[PDB]
Amino acid sequence: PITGLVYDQRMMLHHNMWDSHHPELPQRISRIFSRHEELRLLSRCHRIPARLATEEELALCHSSKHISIIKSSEHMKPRDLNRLGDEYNSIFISNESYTCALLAAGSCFNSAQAILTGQVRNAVAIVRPPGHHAEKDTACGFCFFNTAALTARYAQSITRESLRVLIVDWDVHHGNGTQHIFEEDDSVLYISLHRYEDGAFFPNSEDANYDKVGLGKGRGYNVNIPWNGGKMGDPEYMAAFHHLVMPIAREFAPELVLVSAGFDAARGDPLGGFQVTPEGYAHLTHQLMSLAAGRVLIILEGGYNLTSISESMSMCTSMLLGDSPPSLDHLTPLKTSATVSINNVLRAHAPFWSSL
Ligand SMILES: O=C(NNC(=O)C(F)F)c1cnc(NCc2ccccc2)nc1
Ligand SMILES: [K+]
Ligand SMILES: [K+]
Ligand SMILES: [Zn+2]
């Protein structure tokens, strides 16, 4: 019963040279690492090394053009870097960005390999830049390559092509990239909870609504749980897991669970406006550990309050290590709109999931 942990300080070299206080800070990953140290969680984990993804690995989800453009930024002067970054929605680029993104992806491949070969039971990946907004052909929302989507394909590449991978994306934003990449795929079940506001929240697309259930062979294998009109917190997320995430996941019977674990739904986050607590995140993790024979990989996505994300992700790792869930606060009655969101998803997915 071993928990893997990957962290490599080289991943802080990706930085914003015009706005050094941009919220996607290098010290996001070092602060999470430090909090694992001072909670004495780090020494309880088995350290998994980082590595670069290869270009061939990137091609599992991304076009050759996009790979070549981000790759070319390593040798760019600042004027090129600022101009290229401005070609995307919410991207900054430095000469180190490409390498950091390769390290983020490769760190997760190694963690997935360790899980799948039984060297560890589960694992946590403290990586940046994040991934779930990255599309097949473009960068977006602080993400260059879709680390979680790539890890699901990497996992299938070292097992069998049809390995059932569940991606739970509890970052406060919709994983537009992850949805698109697997939208026609029934071997990767994508479940995202996100602040939506009828499309008035980044990434600002109706693709995130509950009626997008997947396409072609993938119909039923895309589950959007969109939040509207309400500062959601632990009661709402517990309810979504009880009514939607856990029943669908158990029916799917994944062989590997990837968490796109953004922590910007956390209490205190400057962008998300939500109030999921560190103990809420522990319970969400503890619940996901009842799937896939405990084979869970927690991948850092967003989350921008350094104290909030450090405590929040440390508590997830505590659950991975087998610690008992901390007690939740008395769960207030669900915001009315949250009940409406859950009922809309239930109606959308009852046709495909008999457990609903
Ligand atoms: O937090 C986000 N996405 N969630 C993730 O996990 C990500 F890290 F992969 C996010 C992405 N883009 C934006 N654009 C707007 C804006 C840019 C700069 C500052 C403040 C706002 N916003 C929020
Ligand atoms: K999400
Ligand atoms: K899918
Ligand atoms: Zn986010």
From TrEMBL:
Part of the full-length chain shown: 290 to 645 of 929
Biological source species: Danio rerio (Zebrafish)
Family: Belongs to the histone deacetylase family. HD type 2 subfamily.
Designated name of the protein: Protein deacetylase HDAC6
Top-level taxonomic group: Eukaryota
Subcellular location: Cell projection, Axon; Cell projection, Dendrite; Cytoplasm, Cytoskeleton, Cilium basal body; Cytoplasm, Cytoskeleton, Microtubule organizing center, Centrosome
Binding site for Zn(2+): D171, H173, D264
